[PDB]
Design a protein around this ligand. Structure first.
Ligand SMILES: CC(C)CCC[C@H](C)CCC[C@@H](C)CCC[C@H](C)CCOC[C@H](COP(=O)(O)OC[C@@H](O)COP(=O)(O)O)OCC[C@@H](C)CCC[C@H](C)CCC[C@@H](C)CCCC(C)C
Ligand SMILES: CC(C)CCC[C@H](C)CCC[C@@H](C)CCC[C@H](C)CCOC[C@H](COP(=O)(O)OC[C@@H](O)COP(=O)(O)O)OCC[C@@H](C)CCC[C@H](C)CCC[C@@H](C)CCCC(C)C
Ligand SMILES: CC(C)CCC[C@H](C)CCC[C@@H](C)CCC[C@H](C)CCOC[C@H](COP(=O)(O)OC[C@@H](O)COP(=O)(O)O)OCC[C@@H](C)CCC[C@H](C)CCC[C@@H](C)CCCC(C)C
Ligand SMILES: *C/C=C(C)/C=C/C=C(C)/C=C/C1=C(C)CCCC1(C)C
Ligand SMILES: *C/C=C(C)/C=C/C=C(C)/C=C/C1=C(C)CCCC1(C)C
Ligand SMILES: *C/C=C(C)/C=C/C=C(C)/C=C/C1=C(C)CCCC1(C)C
Lengths: 221, 221, 221
């Protein structure tokens, strides 16, 4: 399938973006700046790793459904499993948040990725959609604590902090909305948009969120 | 098997108890109160999720043993894997504990659930019992740091704190004792009590611990 | 295979070393000393658990490669998955480190064990070596933050602290270097050194690192 030219493209970028933040953060003496550079460079590194497994083949196993065996891309749920909490912990660290607030976000996020995978590998039943919906519920709570909650706290900060968070939250809500759209439309969902294109859309939102988020946040607060 | 009318019953309650703490905690402005509401609502939510997987079928795979294939309910070990550390972290957060104390509890608890699963899915050998015993050892240490350790620290607090912890520890030790009893007696163990009843007993202790713990603790400290 | 007399030997020692730190730490009233005893006794306990699974057989599954099915010892990647971050968190706790510093070490370590396993269970392709190399990269970063980074901070402490860290870092860098050597030379890698001997080498470095590290650090700071 031509999807290899999208995995190949991704592994290239994610790996480069990792090598990029790796050399930029080599100077950070400051603790807080050192900290943000920690999360932000940890998320792209993982993306590369999984994208390699995805391309090489390890992260691809045929799963029954209906009457035919379909191309499951479970490695995506491994990337997302860690990559995601780190990105949320990132924002909450910036916009000084509560242990209750961060522990719950990452809690509902963990339900977001896990519930998602469960339905991604559901035996064969069209019960997949039910899990999709549970993930939707979860993601709705996530973008609520993010949007409305944090912004208020973003007003307790200097213009830089309120600004970076502004763009970051924007990018974060928008990108995280397109994900479940690409999922339902493609493989795991119906099959309307083929895997080739689905894998491109996901690779696009993936390179977008993780590297964009890095470049925008990394811009000195 | 009639066990579906126990999974169905559970998923109903766990999910409702989740929706309940979800609406009660919407008002918590205070940080500490916000925090406890975080753990306490995170544990029931997970229980529901897994109970759905349990009912729908995902969390049920046939495993060899002796000469016949048996009904393994591994999803229980996924629920317990997270649900448990959160409940211990809960109590230790109330009765102000040490990083050494909490990190070790959750450490021995993680050995409690993992060792448990290993023997729950042991190939076919009657080596299952050995793992059971290791879990017993682990759980003994757990109820020791809980009972004797924390109570002493419960005396350094206001009557509310010493009180809630009192009932909470009571409920926690009692319920956590019945669990390994139901395990040895049923499926994974001998087969004395059928799965139908075992699944009821587990669903009872499950709805009991998680929702009861929530209602009792949630009662303002 | 005679490798059972190495797993048996290991499970014996690891379990004993666990029982040893368990009785020594029963007196620690001090918080910090209590804390270090927490990590240090948690790592050996896990080693025993997995070594039992390794011996009994659970942690051994035949995997295709080339044309013949090979003896994969995945349980090692379960031990290492947790045992390792705990040992690094240990050193960083001693030589007062940053959240950025500890979160990144444990981050690159998690990539160390995961990437390692991925290639340990790679379908059959000689793509195993590529993952080996990624692990090498990861481990290189790890021993860099350890060696050069921490030592500088080791100079901000009393002679005891600078001393224990000295020996600990020595033992840690040396032992962690022999590991990937034993891996490439044996099973997962080429097949030069048989599993019998490989399992001995690994059991030696395992009993060495975890119990030695414990004895040396546990020596009052
Ligand atoms: C091979 C050799 C490699 C390992 C070299 C890399 C070195 C690296 C840049 C470390 C630099 O030093 C850490 C700096 C802060 O130094 P800082 O402490 O401020 O210096 C002054 C005080 O220490 C003392 O005080 P005084 O000066 O007065 O004496 O920033 C710390 C920044 C981190 C928080 C960055 C987070 C990223 C995360 C680790 C990515 C994971 C990547 C890995 C899987 C590795 C991948 C390898 C592959 C790509 C091949
Ligand atoms: C769809 C729409 C949904 C998302 C709406 C839900 C909103 C929810 C109640 C959030 C309320 O606000 C958070 C409050 C504290 O507000 P608080 O900060 O005190 O307000 C004042 C200062 O912010 C500023 O100061 P000032 O007023 O002076 O300006 O409590 C915080 C309490 C948490 C700690 C609760 C923990 C539970 C955990 C998150 C459960 C997981 C559940 C998920 C998987 C979601 C499931 C969805 C399904 C059931 C369908
Ligand atoms: C069966 C019975 C067993 C459980 C008994 C074991 C008890 C154990 C030693 C606990 C001792 O008390 C904890 C002490 C500190 O007491 P401390 O708080 O200083 O006392 C004074 C103040 O509390 C109050 O003040 P005041 O005196 O003024 O009133 O150290 C705390 C040390 C920890 C941090 C040790 C970390 C190791 C970790 C838990 C290993 C995991 C092992 C498990 C899986 C269990 C394995 C079981 C198998 C081997 C069979
Ligand atoms: C770097 C990668 C990021 C930020 C990935 C984020 C992924 C999601 C927010 C995924 C959400 C999903 C659902 C809500 C339901 C279907 C499954 C997912 C994972 C596509
Ligand atoms: C909400 C669920 C809770 C609090 C579940 C707790 C479960 C246990 C304490 C289980 C203990 C077990 C053993 C000691 C050995 C056999 C396996 C278990 C999981 C039944
Ligand atoms: C108690 C056990 C310890 C400290 C184990 C440490 C193991 C390692 C540092 C392993 C490193 C590896 C690689 C760099 C590549 C091949 C796979 C490993 C796990 C052998």
């Amino acid at each position: 399938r031509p999807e290899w030219i999208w995995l190949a493209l991704g592994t290239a970028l994610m790996g480069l973006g990792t090598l990029y933040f790796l050399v930029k953060g080599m100077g950070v003496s400051d603790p807080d700046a050192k900290k943000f550079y920690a999360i932000t460079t940890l998320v792209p590194a993982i993306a590369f790793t999984m994208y390699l497994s995805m391309l090489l083949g390890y992260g691809l196993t045929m799963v029954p459904f209906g009457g035919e065996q379909n191309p499951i891309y479970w490695a995506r749920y491994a990337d997302w499993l860690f990559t995601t909490p780190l990105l949320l912990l990132d924002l909450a660290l910036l916009v000084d948040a509560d242990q209750g607030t961060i522990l719950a976000l990452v809690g509902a996020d963990g339900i977001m990725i896990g519930t998602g995978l469960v339905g991604a590998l559901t035996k064969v039943y069209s019960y997949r959609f039910v899990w999709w919906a549970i993930s939707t519920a979860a993601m709705l709570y996530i973008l609520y604590v993010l949007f409305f909650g944090f912004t208020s706290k973003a007003e307790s900060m200097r213009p830089e902090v309120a600004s970076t968070f502004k763009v970051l939250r924007n990018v974060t809500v928008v990108l995280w909305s397109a994900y479940p759209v690409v999922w339902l439309i493609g493989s795991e969902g119906a099959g309307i948009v083929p895997l080739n294109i689905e894998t491109l859309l996901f690779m696009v939102l993936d390179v977008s969120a993780k590297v964009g988020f890095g470049l925008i946040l990394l811009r000195s607060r």
